[PDB]
Amino acid sequence: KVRWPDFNQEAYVGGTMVRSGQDPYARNKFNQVESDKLRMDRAIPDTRHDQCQRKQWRVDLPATSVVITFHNEARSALLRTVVSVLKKSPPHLIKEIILVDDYSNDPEDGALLGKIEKVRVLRNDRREGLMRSRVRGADAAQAKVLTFLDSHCECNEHWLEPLLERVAEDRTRVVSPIIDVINMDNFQYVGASADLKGGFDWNLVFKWDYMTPEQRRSRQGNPVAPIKTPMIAGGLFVMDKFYFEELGKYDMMMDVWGGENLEISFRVWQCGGSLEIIPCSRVGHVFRKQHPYTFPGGSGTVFARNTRRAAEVWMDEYKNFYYAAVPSARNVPYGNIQSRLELRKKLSCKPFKWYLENVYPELRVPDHQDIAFGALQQGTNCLDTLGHFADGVVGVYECHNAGGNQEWALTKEKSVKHMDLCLTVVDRAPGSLIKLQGCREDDSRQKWEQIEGNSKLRHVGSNLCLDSRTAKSGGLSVEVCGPALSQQWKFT
Amino acid sequence: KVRWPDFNQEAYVGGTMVRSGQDPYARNKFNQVESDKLRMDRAIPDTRHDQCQRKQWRVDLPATSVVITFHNEARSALLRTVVSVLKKSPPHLIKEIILVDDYSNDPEDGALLGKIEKVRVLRNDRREGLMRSRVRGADAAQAKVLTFLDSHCECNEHWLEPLLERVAEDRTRVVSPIIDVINMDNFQYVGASADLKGGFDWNLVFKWDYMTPEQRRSRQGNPVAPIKTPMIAGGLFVMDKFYFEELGKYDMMMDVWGGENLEISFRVWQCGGSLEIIPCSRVGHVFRKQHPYTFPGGSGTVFARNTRRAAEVWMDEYKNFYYAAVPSARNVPYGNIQSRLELRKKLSCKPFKWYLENVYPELRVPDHQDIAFGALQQGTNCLDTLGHFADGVVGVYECHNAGGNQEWALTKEKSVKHMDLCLTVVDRAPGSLIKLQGCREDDSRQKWEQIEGNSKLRHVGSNLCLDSRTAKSGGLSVEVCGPALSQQWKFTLNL
Ligand SMILES: O=c1ccn([C@@H]2O[C@H](COP(=O)(O)OP(=O)(O)O)[C@@H](O)[C@H]2O)c(=O)[nH]1
Ligand SMILES: O=c1ccn([C@@H]2O[C@H](COP(=O)(O)OP(=O)(O)O)[C@@H](O)[C@H]2O)c(=O)[nH]1
Ligand SMILES: [Mn+2]
Ligand SMILES: [Mn+2]
Questions:
Q1: At a CB cut-off of 8 Å and minimum separation 6, what does B56 contact?
Q2: Which of A74, A89, B58, B331 is most buried, most CB within 10 Å of its CB?
């Protein structure tokens, strides 16, 4: 067994290098030439808040077993992940690093790293995916605490202690670092924002939200305190090993990638635990836009199956909002979920409604009877209040997909509302400007209907259509319904 | 004295009507022909939330003295204001209606209304303005509670009781209705949004803000509860008369119009009271875009003087952010403020910092050492994160004056930050996209400086300037500094 600095990087990485004139992105969907130029222990900036840097860390903490699964990872990235763990962590807190080789083309990618101090490799005999691979690693772990990392990460200074501190104090906390960005094109290590929480839209796709201004102000007195998060990214976290086992590990029927982060996040929160982001812990990750590896049956379908298994188990009736956003998903078969359902019963988990009220209250929930919702689009332009209030005109600006003044709904009452203001036909003469006024269910002047395959908006009981021809010279108007481009509007 | 329905509207309004062929907007800056067509007690829609419509209050409420000041008001609007008070209020709660005629051209506009039940008229011998006029009315008032209304309002159903209920329960509350819109062109009465609070930007100009999503959720269990507001619009409110006197009435040196709403709002909050909007109370107001009346020295100057008197007394150091937004104001003389300053001392009022933390925390406040702040504007476009986070490109969208992704600062450390992300020069080759990255004081790639009279942004120690030419085809870039329009950028506040 070899100490990490004595490992021959050139011998390991050389041989698998990008051949003169070939595509440097095809193998990994990140730039392998830039990854391969880097030293295995390359220096990275210290992206931690200044208060983290002066803190002296407890080291009388339980040791962890680090589990890293991989399938056809670039050698340089995989080695660098392993050495960042070894170099940046107090040695007595790294029990072992378990590499789960998930049926990589070349078994040597993993096996050669087995010579490094503390590294143990487990090879899957066939492709199993990240969920089953992680469980295999977790089942082999000897330590009290599990750390999961992707195979293209770089740990920053004193990344580990702040995470272990949390779980040592309360075993029901599942904790994450701030995930810095390793640029997929140039491999620069870039400090992320510390002001984010994880979350998702009803399509169940992970996204980062900024904290609210009031959340940020409430932290001004300790800006590096833990941040409770509705959802973790899912690749990088630390969890008490027995807690992981007792909560049901992962759903063993999820395949290759996607959705397991949903499932564990809902499960942890609903069943009595918590999820945190720990600002003093910084780890870089190579974010990419595309997957480099195979999906048995296409990635659209596998993601949908995994996501459905999460939704059917955890979301109660709120699953229907997922299906409302992704109707294609109702047709993807998902398999037996009985063991998961009984796991939920066994654990006395709270309902999804509780999750929404107590964990993720800032997730906007549709009125069950809303007809349409979101932005109202015409070309690249979007219906916009222009910051106006009651008795104000309405207009368009370029769609920014950020809500605010471009948030609308078509209601059960047939009104096109923003907040409690409704598009109002003040005057039926063609060319008359429409106005924002307080919504009233009885006001016929506020009734609208979609027509011509949800491509236009007609004022109910008239032949007037919403029209943008005067938008930059007074505001939106009502015009006689006709073939013009200025009367095309679609909710999205 | 005559009951309001026996008052001859046609005789009062007729004679001052818009003369055959003349401009119907010149006299009032609203459409006088449309105002004059209306009955004095015309029906208006009930714009109250449904819960208001079935609601009881206490019922032993203190009566109010209604004060309405006016200068050259349209007779039809003035009459209609008075009759809406008389018709829509329980008679035992209207002690009197005091009309303060602030030196109108024709003294008969007011005097003729003196024949109406409960109406008392006080004429100023010279022009005094709304602040001094209100105080005169308040000083004449006999009731426990004051109600101030403009001379072109229309009270809606059960407008008064919900307001009096609040001040009867706690005399330190100064309370307002939701102010519905009476359209200045057609005089239609339009229901306003109930989801607003008053506020202001650093230019100290009143504006309406939507409540936050978390404020709205916390009200889901009683959607017509009082709404605490950092600032009132200022025309329409109710206040315990003794509380009004004890807090210092209004600043008697403010002239004609503007700024008194700032001053009373800061004073009430800082000195122990509160400000509320009461959704069950609805009153329409003729909003207009221009003033119909004279300002001794121009309206820009009078507004600035009044505003400065508010700022110098109440805002402590935060006045400098007002001056940073309106540098022209540092040159407007404001007069002696000593009585106001001692009033502040006498009352043990809290500092403006307290106001910002506890009353108006959603007003974005620059760091004391920030160089510049706000939006970064180029024409009608604004620097925008595009919802991106670290390692993301940056761009522009049309300025929406709503903060969010168009909020920036130029810091003590020379960085252009949004949240804890900073514009970062990743690559110095001209045309290279800039990126958002976590702010670090040591990173020379994040240093920027204003040049050419605060009209551009140059990357420090280079001849590269922030540039928008690739904004819709990749993002903002760094380009060699030159005379192009795509390199013009101005912060809305410069210290
Ligand atoms: O079939 C698979 C697919 C992915 N992975 C690994 O699981 C982790 C997460 O995958 P990826 O980084 O592709 O996901 P992302 O972080 O991009 O969402 C990485 O270490 C992959 O090499 C794996 O072991 N088997
Ligand atoms: O010098 C003045 C200016 C205004 N007013 C009256 O004060 C009220 C407030 O003025 P205005 O409605 O112009 O303010 P706005 O609501 O337009 O801000 C009105 O009843 C005016 O006629 C007055 O008595 N003296
Ligand atoms: Mn990854
Ligand atoms: Mn007014």
A1: none
A2: A74
Distance (Å) of CA A221 to CA A225, A236, A423, A483, B409: 9, 27, 44, 59, 21
- Reduced to 3 states (helix: H, G, I; strand: E, B; else coil), residue B485 is helix
Cα end-to-end span (Å), chain A = 58
| Resolution for this experimental structure (Å) | 2.3
Q: Can you tell me the distance from the alpha carbon of A159 to that of A177, in angstroms, rounded to the nearest whole number?
A: 7
For residues A283 and A159, the answer to whether their CB atoms sit within 8 Å is: yes
Q: Which of B418, B404, B417, B421 has its CA nearest to residue B213?
A: B404
CA gap A363, A230 in Å, rounded: 10
Half-sphere exposure for B94 (CA within 13 Å, toward CB): 23
Nearest CA among B230, B246, B389 for reference residue A193: B389
Q: Do residues B379 and B371 touch, judged by C-beta distance below 8 A?
A: no
**A8 — alpha (psi -120 to 50), left (phi > 0) or beta?**
beta
Q: Is the dihedral of CA B67, B73, B79, B84 positive or negative?
A: negative
| A221 touching B (Cβ < 8 Å) | no
Burial class (CB in 10 A: 0-12, 13-18, 19+), B134: buried
* Count of H-run helices and E-run strands, chain A: 14, 25
DSSP per-residue string spanning A127-174: --HHHHHHHHHHHH--SSEEEEE-SSEEE-TT-SHHHHHHHHH-TTEE
Say whether residue A175 is in contact with chain B using an 8 A CB cutoff. Answer: no
Which atom of ligand 2 is closest in space to residue B150's alpha carbon? Answer: 20
A207 touches chain B (CB under 8 A): no
Distance (Å, whole) CA B113 – CA B102:
15
Ion ligand 3 residues within 5 Å by Cβ: A 150
- Dihedral class, residue B262 (left if φ above 0, else alpha if ψ from -120 to 50, else beta): alpha
Ligand 1 pocket at CB < 6 A: A 69-71, 73, 102, 129-130, 133, 150-151, 235, 256-257, 288, 291, 293
Interface of A with B in 133-152 (CB under 8 A): none
The domain spans of chain B are 1-363, 364-495
How far apart (Å, rounded) are the C-alpha atoms in residues A304 and A334?
8
CA dihedral in degrees (B477, B482, B483, B487; nearest 10)?
A: 20
Pairing of strands B119-123, B94-101: parallel
β strands within A385-463, DSSP E: 395-398, 408-410, 416-418, 421-424, 435-438, 448-451, 456-459
Q: What fold is seen in the domain B1-363?
A: Spore Coat Polysaccharide Biosynthesis Protein SpsA; Chain A (3.90.550)
- Round to whole Å and give the CA distance between A148 and A150: 7
Q: Report d(CA A416, CA A290) in Å as an integer.
A: 38
Solved how? X-ray
d(CA B157, CA B281): 8
Measured on CA atoms in the order B352, B354, B359, B364, is the torsion positive or negative?
positive
Q: Three-state SS for B14?
A: coil
- Asked if residues A84 and A286 have their Cβ atoms less than 8 Å apart, the reply is no
B91: how many CB neighbours lie within 10 A of its CB? 9
Spatial separation of the C-alpha atoms in residues B148 and B132, rounded to whole Å: 13
Minimum CA–CA partner of A399 in chain B? B397
Backbone angles phi, psi at B410, to 5 degrees: -105, 115
**Both structure tokens of A107:** 């078994």
- For the purposes of burial, counting CB atoms within 10 Å of the CB of B1, is it exposed (0-12), middle (13-18) or buried (19 or more)? exposed
Q: ∠B268-B97-B116 over CA atoms, to 5°? A: 170
